[PDB]
Symmetry: C3
């Protein structure tokens, strides 16, 4: 059950009640497609049906040409955030594929998949991989296609032999279009890279918990968007690429989303107002005794009450950062603010409603679709829940509120920007903390007092 | 069309006038359904070749259908000086529509209204009257043409023309699923698979707007699609329904202008003794309801040669006196915004009808013609050159191109305002401010220096 | 072969050893698909094999009509710190508007009547090599025109549907892409430009044969850096402009800069001052100056070669190279930023990983087989990738380039220790070495005279 609190005193909001799925590990597997080494050229005859085998046979040499160029390439992920300088996310799959490039690794695959279509392959340089045959084009091409090419005089048969070769190429050709427009590395993992059957199975044969197995299966569209598929080789009549799947080694811990907006004084004199915005907006999830914080919006994906994030894109904070929602002046964690003189209207749509910051002569309203205007916001920072509100307007900008189901609570309090004397309030867009502003106030009180010695 | 441009030397900036507005203020939503037929009975022996083909194309028909059910189970969304934005949700109104279709009993209501015909308005329940279109009727084809073949245990293997025909009639159904599954069921731009021009043009032409707005959308169908969303909803009870959300241009043929700025720095020799200044709120500006809507980010507004298509969701409402800054940056009615610094480095900005060059220090700043070559060499300072004679511009080892789009430019002569500032008290840490807010900081230092005269 | 130096003095590393491939110019060709002008069925009847062709002709027309809506829609893309703004496809938009002039198409069609490849001088001075990649007009006018465009029309065989589909394929995909991409696409696909045409088009380019091997062996990078521009479908020919890159600077040294926060390690929270070298990214020697590429996307790497678009560059003095040898040198004023944020973090370099660790933070470095092999102390420290597979700072795990290369550790005393914390401007001052000196001296000035009593 999702609930939201609003803190009038700091113009912030926490959406509590969520449940974590935090990627911690990776699960790589190798997917092979066995290709039949069709050499070159057709059979003496230009029957339009033989002309048609050519065209579709021209596609297969071309698909192989592209996959041959991506093998030779050095794959790499082309995907206020100066706190992040992260590395690669496919370092583990590149780690398998550079070893698939070693001479003699393809025969080690061909041995393991001789009786089965899935086995764990013990190959060179100290890595095991689950390798899976998903497609056997060797059986087809060399059995009921190649003799019609193995015949220097091919009488093209009934037409349905051209339709069928279109159908067994189709997937391989969809694979190559993805790889070829993504320099080898594709995300999300499509259903042509890994069909539901194969994926729902590959998860099943993942050594994970029953907790993690049921979570991934019920969230397959979430899994594919945070997985990778990585072209590796086409070599010795086999195509292979590595797939890189997320491992959610944190589950069902509490998460919450912080929401923030400017908190300013509301004096009539123009320019003479100072502002205050808590600045660590984003996702927080309890993790391993600390708090994992995801400043990027793009990093986390919600499926109705569960937050899937990638710990690579996160900052580790002590659990006392939670106190920043209890009391910003607590002596245990120096809460982050930043100051300014910019009292400009702006509304933040939260998880269960909207923070509205209205200053000056700005028209700020909250509305129901059938009822009409149900609130007009005064200067200062207010909030409206999502019971009865469908939209919020600030000036001429229209914001839709979330209508999912949850209890809000409005937590009263005095706007803390009232606790500061403006004359010595540092407003030069100063991204600091609570004490580091007090850092400057005592200096500013003293810098005036020292010149008061006469 | 007709586009003009004034380059202001006094402040190292330009404004392009003559554009006319089309600002998105609302969403027109429609329900697009493709009737299906519920089959799971692939019982057929038919070892002969023309059954394997129909078996395989049919299999594609189920794994698409399965992909689409997982999407019904999902909850989609989007995450869409450029920071002040309004954080909202682009597709909240089409998700409202899609919630009712998840209620049980809503599909018959659709089938009741859409029984004979293709386009009707459907009262679903609790505040939903939605235009629904039936864009393809597979059920008839599958009960009438394809059920006789597969569903009989005889399984009379129909002509090869059936294998090809069924491929035609899956293709749209099969491209739609590709698009939804790799975008998580929200797509943009709305693609022709999702909505044809015949379909789109009709929906436009029967949008309850004026023929003007109809005439505008029909002649900018590619802009319209780029600003329209399509959200999958449900595949249920032999019906597939996806919600289509089309932009509604509530502000039309109001004047727009684009603001370009570049740094205005001094040209003293002793290096690092030069101060700078830069007008800040660059972007698109349009006249909108007695106010000015300002769209700081470039990916928002789209131009077709003289018409600017902006989404008001990503705008900032400003008083019509923000126009004063393009008249006099020292005006008393709007506190024009500037940011200041001491790092003076060359850079160039391509305007709508020319290019600003801000040449500073040891840099080679030129502007060339295609036929003649280098036709201008920038002395130190901020200057301008228009597209009447110039094709390109090089600043250091970087080359920009200019628009050969036709339009009268105007070089407005005047003295750079940073010559008015005494460098000793100039605030130039990296102050992100206004003219007066700067002047405020200038007064304090002067006051504290006047005191230090004893 | 690649190497990497870490500078303990200033918590930064430079990775040397790269060869530049800098896109300084463009190269436009026009791609044409000759089409046929054909209209409504005129086959009255509903034969099964005839309804298949009606669908396939409907796709043709719906693709032709949606192409037409692209020929009159102004095409452009939206292609970054103190970087300015340019327009990536103006070289191609130049040609595309000439093709809209009248007569240009018969001039094209004249030179390409017998040959598939020619150079055509259009009526504004500059000429363009133009090429013919699909001739459907002959196919629609010779093989199909008879059947469909006659009142009496036996559908000769079902194979007539198949080849019309197969001859239709590229035109239908070329229309798909141009439609989600408002007539300009990147990277260039093989539907837009197959491999043979591309290799050929490279072959005919006026470049060094060192340059031709470079593109030919990096086609996939070359495609990422090319654009495709929809121009016209009018008077029985579909023409779009391809704009391929001209890497006018080759075989010069490149290097990439990584930096991290360098703070003091007093135990008192907040009593620490930090220091970070700014302007991190890729640098390459270019024409007596050094082009700096601030954005990660602007350069694409193939192991020791860097392909960068110089539109998204900056031209810096070559003395900026001294900021890696002595950040106090009197010839170039090295850029830093001060803070009081002493957070632990890691940066993954070209050959290792920088860990700047602070507070009570657990920062290790681990091997796949061995486990932790180093717990970092409070400070800014480095580790080479021989031995190391991953790094953890808190609960976040970073992998490391396993790329072959040598690293050298340069010991020095952290510069953050050469500052009096009492007068150090640590209010997130994006400034330089001497600009920070100036705030210190001025602060030491108001300290100086106000303390004569
Ligand atoms: C001066 O310092 C005290 C503690 O040293 C701090 O709490 C206070 O906020 C400062 N003065 C003002 C007016 O804030
Ligand atoms: C500074 O204050 C004086 C009054 O002492 C005022 O006249 C002047 O206009 C102020 N400076 C500026 C730049 O407005
Ligand atoms: C600052 O300038 C004064 C000039 O009186 C000079 O004596 C002093 O050495 C300078 N600061 C430093 C750190 O050298």
């Amino acid at each position: 059950n999702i609930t939201e609190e609003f803190y009038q005193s700091t113009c912030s909001a926490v959406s509590k009640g969520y449940l974590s799925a935090l990627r911690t590990g990776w699960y790589t597997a190798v997917i092979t497609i066995f290709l039949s080494n069709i050499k070159e050229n057709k059979c003496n005859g230009t029957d339009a049906k033989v002309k048609l085998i050519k065209q579709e046979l021209d596609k297969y040499k071309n698909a192989v040409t592209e996959l041959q160029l991506l093998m030779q390439s050095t794959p790499a992920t082309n995907n206020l955030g100066f706190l992040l300088g992260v590395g690669s996310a496919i370092a583990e799959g590149v780690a398998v594929s550079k070893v698939l490039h070693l001479e003699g690794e393809v025969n080690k695959i061909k041995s393991a998949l001789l009786s089965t279509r899935k086995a764990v392959v013990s190959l060179s340089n100290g890595v095991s991989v689950l390798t899976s045959k998903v497609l056997d084009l060797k059986n087809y091409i060399d059995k009921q296609l190649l003799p019609i090419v193995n015949k220097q005089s091919c009488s093209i048969s009934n037409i349905e032999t051209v339709i069928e070769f279109q159908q067994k190429l189709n997937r391989l050709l969809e694979i190559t279009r993805e790889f070829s427009v993504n320099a080898g590395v594709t995300t999300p993992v499509s259903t042509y890279m890994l069909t539901n059957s194969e994926l729902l199975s590959l998860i099943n044969d993942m050594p994970i918990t029953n907790d993690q197995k049921k979570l991934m299966s019920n969230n397959v569209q979430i899994v594919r968007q945070q997985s990778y598929s990585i072209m590796s080789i086409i070599k010795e009549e086999v195509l292979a690429y590595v797939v890189q799947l997320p491992l959610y080694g944190v589950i069902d811990t509490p998460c919450w989303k912080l929401h923030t907006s400017p908190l300013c004084t509301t004096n009539t004199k123009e320019g003479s107002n100072i502002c205050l915005t808590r600045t660590d907006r984003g996702w927080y999830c309890d993790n391993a005794g600390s708090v994992s914080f995801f400043p990027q919006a793009e990093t986390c994906k919600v499926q109705s009450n569960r937050v899937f994030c990638d710990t690579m894109n996160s900052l580790t904070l002590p659990s006392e950062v939670k106190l920043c929602n209890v009391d910003i002046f607590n002596p245990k964690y120096d809460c982050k603010i930043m100051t300014s003189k910019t009292d400009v209207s702006s509304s933040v749509i939260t998880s269960l409603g909207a923070i509205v910051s209205c200053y000056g002569k700005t028209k700020c309203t909250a509305s129901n679709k059938n009822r009409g205007i149900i609130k007009t916001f005064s200067n200062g920072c207010d909030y409206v829940s999502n019971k009865g509100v469908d939209t919020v307007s600030v000036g001429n900008t229209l914001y839709y509120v979330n209508k999912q189901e949850g209890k809000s609570l409005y937590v009263k309090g005095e706007p803390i920007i009232n606790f500061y004397d403006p004359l010595v309030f540092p407003s030069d867009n100063f991204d600091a903390s609570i004490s580091q502003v007090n850092e400057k106030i005592n200096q500013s009180l003293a810098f005036i007092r020292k010149s008061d010695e006469l």
